[PDB]
Amino acid sequence: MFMINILMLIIPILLAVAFLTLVERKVLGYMQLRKGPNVVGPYGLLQPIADAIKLFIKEPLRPATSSASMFILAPIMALGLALTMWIPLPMPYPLINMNLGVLFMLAMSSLAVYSILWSGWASNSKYALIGALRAVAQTISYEVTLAIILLSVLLMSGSFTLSTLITTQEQMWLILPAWPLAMMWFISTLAETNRAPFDLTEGESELVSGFNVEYAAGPFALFFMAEYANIIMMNIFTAILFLGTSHNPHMPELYTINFTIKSLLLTMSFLWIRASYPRFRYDQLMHLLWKNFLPLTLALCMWHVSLPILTSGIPPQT
Amino acid sequence: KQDMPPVGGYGPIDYKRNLPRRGLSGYSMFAVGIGALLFGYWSMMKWNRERRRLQIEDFEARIALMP
């Protein structure tokens, strides 16, 4: 029945990414002093069944000027590498056990931006043309900030797999010891996935609407359901790579219970920001990475290398 | 002969500006901070120095049998 363990995953998650869109504007509602979608629910909890159905009734135009062969294979992705990445992710028991799999995320973190470059180019001119070009450029310069500061800690835990990374955070919430890094693990995923303070990719201010501009109701649910299938995953990751829970070979169930009451707090962070801060004006946006974020990330790497060796600490792995 | 201004008495309420309160300033931070980071590593160097002590124990059974 291994095929019914899968399809029990893909389906029950599409409800979260659906019902996030509701808690989008309730939480961001009371920052403003008001209430959130209310009239339709009664509580509102019934809103997203009505919204999923307005789009696919609503007619899906294509530009007369487009290349239809690319205008499909691209979105036929924004929903794969979002739903594949979930596969080897322990909670506690991952569906797959990949030997070195931690590295496998970067494989699928790196291969999504090659679905932006298609779509914005697939269609047409300068609002999605050079406007989907220069959100490529920022999306690849926030990896080098990443793979390093992912690679740092992994000196402090011994291997590439995720079954060890529950063992080492036992009674030490891995955020003490590298708290300088942890910050930069946060501003990255918020800068890379195109969210609030570095917002430019999806346009509001700097342009009209980035990269979404062409898709009518028909395809544009996918992206608007793809872009929220990354955001609740990196943030359902960070908390396996920092704030660890305590496995329990007996009541596995109490592992996940206490696990979603963390990863679900953590997420409610990209909403708790977006009410707050303004945007960066694309110069300042990269111009603050090389100069500023990076020099440290190298420097710390020269540090977490020696700290095990200089304490006879060296973590028990191959 | 019903008009507005009261007989006497008012505020004012000021227009002034103050909202500066801290908050562990001026090197008080960099003091607690570097103090936590250490107790992080001291919490390592022991777990990680214990876990190896089990590591050898595990490779022991392998060599024990396998004649």
Swiss-Prot record, chain A:
InterPro entries: NADH_UbQ_OxRdtase_su1/FPO, NADH_UbQ_OxRdtase_su1_CS
Gene Ontology MF annotations: NADH dehydrogenase (ubiquinone) activity
GO cellular component terms attached to this protein's record: mitochondrial inner membrane; respiratory chain complex I
KW Plastid (keyword) present: no
Subcellular location: Mitochondrion inner membrane
Disulfide bonding pattern of the chain: none
Topological category with respect to the lipid bilayer: Multi-pass membrane protein
GO biological process, one term: mitochondrial respiratory chain complex I assembly
Coarse class of the protein's main subcellular location: mitochondrion
Enzyme Commission number: 7.1.1.2
Enzyme class (EC, first level): translocase
Subunit structure: Core subunit of respiratory chain NADH dehydrogenase (Complex I) which is composed of 45 different subunits.
Protein name (Swiss-Prot/TrEMBL): NADH-ubiquinone oxidoreductase chain 1
Species this chain originates from: Bos taurus (Bovine)
GN (gene name): MT-ND1
Curated annotation (Swiss-Prot), chain B:
Record localization: Mitochondrion inner membrane; Nucleus
Coiled-coil features, chain-numbered ranges: none
Signal peptide: none
Transmembrane segments: 24-45
Subunit structure: Complex I is composed of 45 different subunits. Interacts with CARD15, but not with CARD4. Interacts with STAT3, but not with STAT1, STAT2 and STAT5A. Interacts with OLFM4.
UniProt family annotation: Belongs to the complex I NDUFA13 subunit family.
Summary of the function given for this chain in its UniProt record: Accessory subunit of the mitochondrial membrane respiratory chain NADH dehydrogenase (Complex I), that is believed not to be involved in catalysis. Complex I functions in the transfer of electrons from NADH to the respiratory chain. The immediate electron acceptor for the enzyme is believed to be ubiquinone. Involved in the interferon/all-trans-retinoic acid (IFN/RA) induced cell death. This apoptotic activity is inhibited by interaction with viral IRF1. Prevents the transactivation of STAT3 target genes.
Protein name per Swiss-Prot or TrEMBL: NADH dehydrogenase [ubiquinone] 1 alpha subcomplex subunit 13
Organism this protein belongs to: Bos taurus (Bovine)
Included stretch of the parent chain: 7 to 73 of 144
